[PDB]
Write a protein that binds this DNA or RNA. Structure first.
Lengths: 58, 135, 82
RNA sequence: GGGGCGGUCGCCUCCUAAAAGGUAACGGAGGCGCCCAAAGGUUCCCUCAGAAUGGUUGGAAAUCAUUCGCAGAGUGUAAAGGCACAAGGGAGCUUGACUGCGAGACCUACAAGUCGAGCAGGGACGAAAGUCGGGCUUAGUGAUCCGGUGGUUCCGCAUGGAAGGGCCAUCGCUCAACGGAUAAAAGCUACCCCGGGGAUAACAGGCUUAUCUCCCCCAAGAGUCCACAUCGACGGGGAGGUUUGGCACCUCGAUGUCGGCUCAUCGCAUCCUGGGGCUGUAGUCGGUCCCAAGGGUUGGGCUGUUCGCCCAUUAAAGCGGUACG
RNA sequence: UAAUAGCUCACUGGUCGAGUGACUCUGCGCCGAAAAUGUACCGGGGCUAAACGUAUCACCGAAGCUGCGGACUGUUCG
RNA sequence: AGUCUUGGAGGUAGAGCACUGAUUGGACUAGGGGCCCCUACCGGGUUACCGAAUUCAGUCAAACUCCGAAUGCCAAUGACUUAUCCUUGGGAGUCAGACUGCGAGUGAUAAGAUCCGUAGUCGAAAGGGAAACAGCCCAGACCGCCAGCUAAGGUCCCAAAGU
RNA sequence: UACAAGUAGUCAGAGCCCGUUAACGGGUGAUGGCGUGCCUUUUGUAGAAUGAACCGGCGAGUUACGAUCUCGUGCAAGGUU
RNA sequence: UGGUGGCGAUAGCGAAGAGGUCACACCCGUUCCCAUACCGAACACGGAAGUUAAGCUCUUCAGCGCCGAUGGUAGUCGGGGGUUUCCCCCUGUGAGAGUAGGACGCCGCCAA
């Protein structure tokens, strides 16, 4: 349902694709924790990025 | 000294090498063969020297198969010139040899003599080789 | 010292033209718009899409574009009114 | 990939081009500065190149007849795309190889370039449908100014005329250095001067090691027989950064370039001296290889020369680095 | 010297009597490996594990992040 | 704008011979060397000594493709997230870029070489690490604190942490 | 301050001395950590690229006339000398 | 059986075999419409002598041609290493020449 998000590795040095994808989830800064609902779109972003950001369930 | 008697163009890209050989990965005509396990170029002088080292030693024993042709030419600018201002003239023919390709194969000859003779010829080529035989 | 070389006589080419489809499958289009700027009949025109003097394809009636296979191998453009 | 010399300068086709488009190099291949009153438009009708077999003059091919034959043949020309439901081939008629335009769209810095249904006036073809606003698609071409020529229901300096200028049609440029400085243009400077550059060359340094010096690997052979005492073909591998170089990274608000003299000092891939293996080492003398950088490693003729050749010697008359100390 | 010599390797017999001989794949390692002011190719010391491979858990480690306080700029209004 | 779904064009990597070329062997024979004679060789007999054409097998291509992805690109639909996009107007500087991955050219698949596409950093970015270092790794400095947790890297001493 | 080499500082810091625009004070600092000035020009400067011997003064985007745009004014289909 | 459409040849090419009173097609002869860059095969013309031979229509077949996922791989997006012109590991993704086999036709509407 609701899966919370944490940006682990800094976006610095990653391609613009990863940068903007991480941006649109609202990740202002490193270790900023974000709570988002679950759906195919969110899982899309997470499986595509998959190494800047860690996902765990509440 | 295998010349290709004609070619569509006398200059073309050096190209690159990746992955195993496309075909001819195992012996097909001879009892035994020799295989190359890395990628590299092979030129008229190499195949000619290896062929002679094979046949002149083997004498009347049998026949030797060659599966290679240096269809690819390669260029080289004239000595002592600033680089650029046109591709250099062609002066040699080369054959691409990806790993897995079997180069030479022998027929109608005993096993041990073919083994040691292929070992002899392998030193002529610049490439680590592995002995290989038909299934 | 130095040595001389020349006579490359290859540094020339045409200022190349643009060739491609500039309406997407499912895009709404308006009459007279361009669909495909081919050079030669690479894909023949279907209903409501014409064939210009320079082998170009243009929509005659405003609507939605659609690409579809023609026969075994050939293609064809069409415009389906909405 | 310093200049000079050589080559090139616009346009069109393809590859390089990384499955949209775009994308450079003194990268890899070709072509254009036209041609066609039919090689256009339209109606109508077909079908190829090559091969086999018979046929004379006549063969390898002239012109015939059969069969096979998805495209090898053609498409004005250079490549690509596409074309046998013709865009290929043939016949009749005809001049749309039209005028006024043009919804929209492509391409784009700008200038320009490209397609375009649809409307009106008149046609051409065909019974009609319906096609025709030049070539089967992409090159075959240039600004503005000035001047020439045709039409003008435009203006024409008191008024009427004119002269002259407008608008439309259209001609004069290998202005080819082809976005075209002017209608009108070549060289030397080591008498040379100024502003700048290490954005850019010569010496040195640096990167690379093609080339160069060494080291080897395989072994055919030579070696009276014996590949490996000695030498080693044809082929492959490496090390060093002393030569010729490729690159332009520091230095052009200045880093002095060859040779010699003076002074040295370092590496060992050793010229002598020391200690050994092998030898086709009888012995004196040798050849090759291993350890060895302690010391030593010559005076003259010629030439600016290092380098070389020569004379006379010595145990030897080493090779290189140190901004070619 | 050319057989003619203790003599030797093909070959089988006897002596005690237990592991022994070919190749394939593969980890790690050795030689091949000669330069110039000085060790000079782990940064030094030094290390036979203080190297490497595999696996587990600790800790250190930035001006990153969180903690407390302060200044300012913005969007919702102090 | 990102992502999820659906639909598109596109001929690269790959693969392959169906076309254009290159190209190895077997079978085979047309046609050539092959000497003898009859003789203008009329033809026979003539070496595998060469040898076109076919068929069996086999290997290659930036300018070969019957095929053909991954990605990238162009849109529609709605779903979640995000809030940056367009028009007009005022004022600029930039036209010497470098390096590191990855795909190519030229070069000898040499160069801290040159020229492209793509992504990053520097340029214009300090901090920790790689001894010293712009471009390699981690990571973005509004100020103060004698706070804590970590990233790369590391824990025998230099030198914080595991002999 | 005579066994230590230091873009010369800063942050730690004992000892000694002094006592302030009274405040979690002033001077000096044995010793430890870190650390290659400034400016221009450059892809790149600690740079062995350039300029400054030091101190003081002087020393560079203004004014006129038009144009345009924003802002502020008085009037407004009028405004204005 | 005729006509005329849509569907990727899974429809083709081959090899055999059946049909025709009606339908179709070969046939009969140019008299006038029309034509043979030469011609009644072809164009049209107006009949109906005989023939299923061919065309056309049906039955059969995997020789050719055609279509065709499954698991493999090669390649590759995105990460991570390595002794790095090139290799290797992980999430996916997915080559084609190869076989499993499908197929020697399926849908119509007007005239029997």
């Amino acid at each position: 349902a609701k899966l919370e998000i944490t940006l682990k590795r800094s976006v610095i040095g990653r391609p613009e694709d990863q940068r903007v994808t991480v941006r649109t989830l609202g990740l202002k800064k490193t270790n900023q924790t974000v709570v988002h609902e679950d759906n195919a779109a969110i899982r899309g972003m997470i499986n595509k990025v998959s190494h800047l950001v860690s996902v765990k369930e509440q | 000294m295998l010349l290709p008697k004609r070619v569509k163009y006398r200059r073309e890209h050096r190209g690159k090498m990746r992955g195993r050989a496309k075909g001819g990965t195992e012996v097909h005509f001879g009892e035994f063969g020799i295989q190359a396990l890395e990628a590299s170029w092979i030129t008229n002088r190499q195949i000619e020297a290896a062929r002679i080292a094979m046949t002149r030693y083997m004498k009347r024993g049998g026949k030797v198969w060659i599966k290679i042709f240096p269809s690819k030419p390669y260029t080289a600018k004239p000595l002592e010139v600033r680089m650029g201002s046109g591709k250099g003239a062609p002066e040699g023919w080369v054959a691409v040899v990806k790993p897995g390709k079997v180069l030479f194969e022998i027929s109608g000859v005993s096993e041990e003599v073919a083994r040691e003779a292929l070992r002899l010829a392998s030193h002529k080529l610049p490439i680590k080789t592995k002995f290989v035989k038909r299934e | 010292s130095k040595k001389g070389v020349g006579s490359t006589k290859n540094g020339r080419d045409s200022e190349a033209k643009r060739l491609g489809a500039k309406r997407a499958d499912g895009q709404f289009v308006t009459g007279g718009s361009i669909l495909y700027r081919q050079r030669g009949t690479k894909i023949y025109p279907g209903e409501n899409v014409g064939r210009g003097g320079d082998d170009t394809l243009f929509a005659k009636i405003d609507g939605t574009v659609k690409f579809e296979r023609f026969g075994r191998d050939r293609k064809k453009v069409s415009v389906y009114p909405v």
